[PDB]
Amino acid sequence: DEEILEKLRSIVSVGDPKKKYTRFEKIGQGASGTVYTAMDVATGQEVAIRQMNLQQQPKKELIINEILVMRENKNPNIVNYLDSYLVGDELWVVMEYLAGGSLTDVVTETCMDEGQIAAVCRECLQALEFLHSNQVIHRDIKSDNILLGMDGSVKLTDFGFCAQITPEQSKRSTMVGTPYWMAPEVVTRKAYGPKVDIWSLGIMAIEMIEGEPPYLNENPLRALYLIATNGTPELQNPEKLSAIFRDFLNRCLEMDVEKRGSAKELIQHQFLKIAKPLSSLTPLIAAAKEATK
């Protein structure tokens, strides 16, 4: 634990963060830590700050991994990691703040059209292709981890479950993902690769169509069994979708991992070419935000 502290203390910026931030509002208080929105004194930028008491963090290596991965894998489609501070055993992680909530708010409060869905899928695939090319698997892709700007910008977040692979050890076996969004091979085999993120993107697409991932109202243990034994999930109203969207979904949700599209391949898919401008999402984001408070 002392070593963890020393490692963290090499990573963080020096001193106390309060020099820097004005106007803390508490928007969250989980097991993960307490989350504030705040304002950067120098830049005027609005930030989201996570405060953690390290005494009560069970798996601190995960936090170090999260910061190190985020630091070295900056991308326009990933929520920007800005800075970190350590004051005694109080750790602060500073992230950029996106004022448009999450995709979850949008899919549960509004109805996306295919052009809007294509835009979101494209932006997510941009993040995934970058990560995968860098040998990083996110492992917990789902609408809650897709954050939005008021302008329609789409960004991936939460690297607390991510994995770094290598040519020597190119597959992982740990089950860390949220069950409704897990690829079947995670439970059926003891090895999976980057394409688990592609499956999860497909489930997210289903969220955007139907408002929920398949089996949501089943016990998570049961959903995992159902995922593994049913395979590619079935839509309620397939006929209502365009042929090209159905094809895109089939490619994300292929049971055979070798046949499932890779992010690089999917970026070329013609479904993404129907994407509306990202600002088309702004009215949905506003409506969802109002609905949620």
Curated annotation (Swiss-Prot):
Domain of life: Eukaryota
Ranges in a coiled coil: none
Catalytic class of the enzyme: transferase
List of catalytic residues: 140
Result, substituting residue 180 to C: In IDDMSSD; gain-of-function; enhanced PAK1 kinase activity and significantly reduced homodimerization
Chemical reaction(s) catalysed: L-seryl-[protein] + ATP = O-phospho-L-seryl-[protein] + ADP + H(+); L-threonyl-[protein] + ATP = O-phospho-L-threonyl-[protein] + ADP + H(+)
UniProt EC number: 2.7.11.1
Binding site for ATP: 27-35, 50, 96-98
Domain Protein kinase: 21-272
Regulation: Activated by binding small G proteins. Binding of GTP-bound CDC42 or RAC1 to the autoregulatory region releases monomers from the autoinhibited dimer, and enables activation by phosphorylation of Thr-174.
PTM statement from Swiss-Prot or TrEMBL: Autophosphorylated in trans, meaning that in a dimer, one kinase molecule phosphorylates the other one. Activated by autophosphorylation at Thr-174 in response to a conformation change, triggered by interaction with GTP-bound CDC42 or RAC1. Activated by phosphorylation at Thr-174 by BRSK2 and by PDPK1. Phosphorylated by JAK2 in response to PRL; this increases PAK1 kinase activity.
Needed co-factor(s): Mg(2+)
Modified residues (Phosphotyrosine): 36
Tissue: Overexpressed in gastric cancer cells and tissues (at protein level).
Substitution effect: residue 140 to N: Abolishes kinase activity
Impact noted for substituting residue 174 to E: Constitutive kinase activity
Keywords of the record: Acetylation, Allosteric enzyme, Apoptosis, ATP-binding, Cell junction, Cell membrane, Cell projection, Chromosome, Cytoplasm, Cytoskeleton, Disease variant, Epilepsy, Exocytosis, Intellectual disability, Kinase, Membrane, Nucleotide-binding, Nucleus, Phosphoprotein, Serine/threonine-protein kinase, Transferase
GO molecular function, one term: protein kinase activity
UniProt family annotation: Belongs to the protein kinase superfamily. STE Ser/Thr protein kinase family. STE20 subfamily.
Related illness: Intellectual developmental disorder with macrocephaly, seizures, and speech delay: An autosomal dominant neurodevelopmental disorder characterized by impaired intellectual development, poor speech, postnatal macrocephaly, and seizures.
Record's function text: Protein kinase involved in intracellular signaling pathways downstream of integrins and receptor-type kinases that plays an important role in cytoskeleton dynamics, in cell adhesion, migration, proliferation, apoptosis, mitosis, and in vesicle-mediated transport processes. Can directly phosphorylate BAD and protects cells against apoptosis. Activated by interaction with CDC42 and RAC1. Functions as a GTPase effector that links the Rho-related GTPases CDC42 and RAC1 to the JNK MAP kinase pathway. Phosphorylates and activates MAP2K1, and thereby mediates activation of downstream MAP kinases.
Subunit field text: Homodimer; homodimerization results in autoinhibition. Active as monomer. Interacts with GIT1. Component of cytoplasmic complexes, which also contains PXN, ARHGEF7 and GIT1. Interacts with NISCH. Interacts with DVL1; mediates the formation of a DVL1, MUSK and PAK1 ternary complex involved in AChR clustering. Binds to the caspase-cleaved p110 isoform of CDC2L1 and CDC2L2, p110C, but not the full-length proteins. Interacts with ARHGEF7. Interacts tightly with GTP-bound but not GDP-bound CDC42/P21 and RAC1. Interacts with SCRIB. Interacts with PDPK1. Interacts (via kinase domain) with RAF1.
Protein name: Serine/threonine-protein kinase PAK 1
Organism: Homo sapiens (Human)
Residues of the whole record sequence present: 250 to 542 of 545
